[PDB]
Amino acid sequence: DDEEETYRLWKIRKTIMQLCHDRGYLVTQDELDQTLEEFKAQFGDKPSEGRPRRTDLTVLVAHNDDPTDQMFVFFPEEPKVGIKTIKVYCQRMQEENITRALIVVQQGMTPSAKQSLVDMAPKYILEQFLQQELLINITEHELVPEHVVMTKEEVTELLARYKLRENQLPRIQAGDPVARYFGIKRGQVVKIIRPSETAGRYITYRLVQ
Amino acid sequence: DREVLRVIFPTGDSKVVLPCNLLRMIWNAQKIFHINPRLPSDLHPIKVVEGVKELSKKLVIVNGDDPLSRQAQENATLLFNIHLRSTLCSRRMAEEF
Amino acid sequence: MFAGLQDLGVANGEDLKETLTNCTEPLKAIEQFQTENGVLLPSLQSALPFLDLHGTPRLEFHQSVFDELRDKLLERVSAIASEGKAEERYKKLEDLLEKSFSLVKMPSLQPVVMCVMKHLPKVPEKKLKLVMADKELYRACAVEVKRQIWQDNQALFGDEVSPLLKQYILEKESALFSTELSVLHNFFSPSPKTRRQGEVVQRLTRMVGKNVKLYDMVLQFLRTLFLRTRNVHYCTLRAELLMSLHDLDVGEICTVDPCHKFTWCLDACIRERFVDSKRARELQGFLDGVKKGQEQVLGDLSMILCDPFAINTLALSTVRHLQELVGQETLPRDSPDLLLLLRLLALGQGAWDMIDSQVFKEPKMEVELITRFLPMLMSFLVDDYTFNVDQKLPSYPNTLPESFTKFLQEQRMACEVGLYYVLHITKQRNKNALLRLLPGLVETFGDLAFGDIFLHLLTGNLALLADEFALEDFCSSLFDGFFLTASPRKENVHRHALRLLIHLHPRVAPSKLEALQKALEPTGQSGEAVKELYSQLGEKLEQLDHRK
Amino acid sequence: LSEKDVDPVRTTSNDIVEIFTVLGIEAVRKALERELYHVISFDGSYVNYRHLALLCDTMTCRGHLMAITRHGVNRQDTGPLMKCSFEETVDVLMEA
Amino acid sequence: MLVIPPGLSEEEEALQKKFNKLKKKKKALLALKKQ
């Protein structure tokens, strides 16, 4: 089909825009809430054997606070990404001066690709994202409370206030869907805001490990 | 505070669990001092306002003046403070109690 | 007081006087004259008695109607500002101003004209000049109108901002000299957004607003002050004002300025405390966009790059890439971004030179700098690494070439880079290379080693190295090699020495404590701040001696 | 959840492991609390929220679903003696 | 315009020699860590 593919591409694009907005990257208001119709009109309404193909709607976004912190979002064509595709993506990012990529695969990439991706991490950080995980925005689910990423200074302020070491905080693993949504790395602390039926509102903290 | 409750309590279930049974203590106060809820009383409403405000400062759960500490203290007794304000209203103290 | 009702044909107080003078029977004249002048409401004639039956004057009635209709006119003019198509609503506003400006001075109908000329996209210039003619109308103008009209009057704006300029300079010169010294809590510690959170910055953002002429006036003022005084705080003011305008996303100012993006980026650099390959690369890409006839902007661009915070950020970035090259065993010429930082620092430091000389051509760099200076400090760092290795292996050679001192004395880039690497290694507790490079700090470019930036950062770093202050050798070497050379004539050096002695006296040995006390007793030729610092030092040391 | 005309906000799944893998550790905590409340208040009784909250917080304190069995609480680093107090005493003693 | 000579300068050569010495010492140290 082509109509369902158009719907899928629009949906994943919308979720990527929301994710970039959540991380603090500068996403304009108009493209954040562009409905299906303008997407169809501007990209092509015919992904199958048509101009709205992949690698055409890849997006670079710059950080709102810092103009020189940017992220590519790529949509590879081959269902199973191999070493060649991530290698050419590395090459493309090489002439650019940016170090952050967001891959949206259609099926799980090859184990060699994952191993190279995790070996590449210290200089060039990039993540994979199955398109199935992107058809919905999980932070809008009622079960997922408010997640906020905490700066290092306020983490130190927390630790000083409660006089506890970082290993005594509750933990969250980097493989968590919300953790991957916010792209947080180890040693980084997340504030969590919940509505409580006994207090009214409860704030807890989680250390990424 | 009404809007805050409505976003904490969807489906409109007002049965909550709280420390002090305010209505029963109001009834006790009415019966101890022989209030006679038929004659006009001598209770300046600003006394009600200031009394609620100064009571809210004494019920401390998180102790400290740090902004983090103040936020934690405010969040800990948010629900009870909402209930206290919704009960000890100047109008409710002026026409019902 | 009816200046303007003569244009509408409204009979005025003079007409009342002449009718009362040429009157035969008062009832006729007064009644007819003010009843034709009264509110022509058909049903109003029945309301008049009932108002005054209790004795309540009908003036209260008319004033109540006036106030209610004033509320209504304010709401309706706000609705005009909100609703209606642009062309029709602008034309309506223009016509309504044209037929209502006759009563602009009257405080009764002032809100009408004030809101109308507030909501106009472009108020007629003749009426703007007339408003500027009357001080009351000028003071009553809204912020939008004041933005719209502040074009010709430059003396008034200069006088308005001069106390703000003075207070800003005093704040920037007092933050550097703060009684508390620390590396993390220093002058450059607050983010540019936090630096703009000040009341002065918000007042200046409100004052400048969206007007191009006001922005250019501020640019000229700051350029002239920087030219006269060589005070780099004007650079920080210009950058903060430009970023505060950027935060509002004012199109009429940001779009016309190519430097607004650069200033936003540079303040981001300051916020991140570093310049990576990305930052230097994009700053190069923007700098190379010098089109024909736009070379003057370079000077103004240099005006942005002469920010003390920006200079600190670029020099610390140079230090970090130098350490990275030491770790990587790679030359600076194999990393173009370090040379990019050097060029950026050169433009920032030569901002004043290019502004004074008015030559809008990029100054050139001598190659001996890169061929000898940076390899020398990298040799020092490699020597420290070799000492560490040989310590682990089952002495540290501190041979300092004098061309280090020569480069620091003559070259501005060598001065900045060497001073910042000294700061970094003093923060790093790198005692050996600190003693190695200390005799080279006696003379630098324009006493940048004795300047406020480096002296504050050095005091902050030594506050971390207070433990070494217990030993006599460390304090003796540091003081004799840096402070005692410029102590008797330079106020800033002696003030920084006094602050360091105050803040690090718990560790200093009693012999060195007393030696520094004798070396730091000010005479009558020093300022009052010196006396205050001496009084604080005496109190602290007396309290310490009381603990015995 | 990705199907059209399906609410992606209110749709739950009664399964804690699936919710953990899809939505995260806080979502599984809230869902686990709701499931315990449903299974306990089904008879019409009442147990104070503090006890469910404490149980759920201990169950999901380490970022992964900690089962209350020996495989969940003995793998947590709490000391050989209380571990042998629970189960497989001599085994954990030999390991220690 | 910035121009850099193709040849290696005096201090560059000394720095590269010290790079070589530090590299050899650190490789010997790592071999010791192997032992």
UniProtKB/TrEMBL annotation, chain A:
Pfam family, one: RNA_pol_Rpb5_N
GO cellular component: DNA-directed RNA polymerase complex; nucleoplasm
Predominant cellular place of this UniProt entry's protein: nucleus
Any one GO molecular-function label of the UniProt entry: DNA binding
All residue ranges annotated as the RNA polymerase subunit H/Rpb5 C-terminal domain in the record: 136-208
Keywords: DNA-directed RNA polymerase, Nucleus, Transcription
The protein, known as: DNA-directed RNA polymerases I, II, and III subunit RPABC1
Organismal lineage: Eukaryota, Metazoa, Chordata, Craniata, Vertebrata
Gene that specifies this protein: POLR2E
From TrEMBL, chain D:
Subcellular location: Chromosome; Cytoplasm; Nucleus
Record's function text: DNA-dependent RNA polymerase catalyzes the transcription of DNA into RNA using the four ribonucleoside triphosphates as substrates. RNA-dependent RNA polymerase that catalyzes the extension of a non-coding RNA (ncRNA) at the 3'-end using the four ribonucleoside triphosphates as substrates. An internal ncRNA sequence near the 3'-end serves as a template in a single-round Pol II-mediated RNA polymerization reaction. May decrease the stability of ncRNAs that repress Pol II-mediated gene transcription.
Signal peptide: none
Location of this fragment in the whole protein: 1347 to 1442 of 1970
Species whose genome carries this gene: Sus scrofa (Pig)
Family: Belongs to the RNA polymerase beta' chain family.
Superkingdom classification of source: Eukaryota
Name this polypeptide is given: DNA-directed RNA polymerase subunit
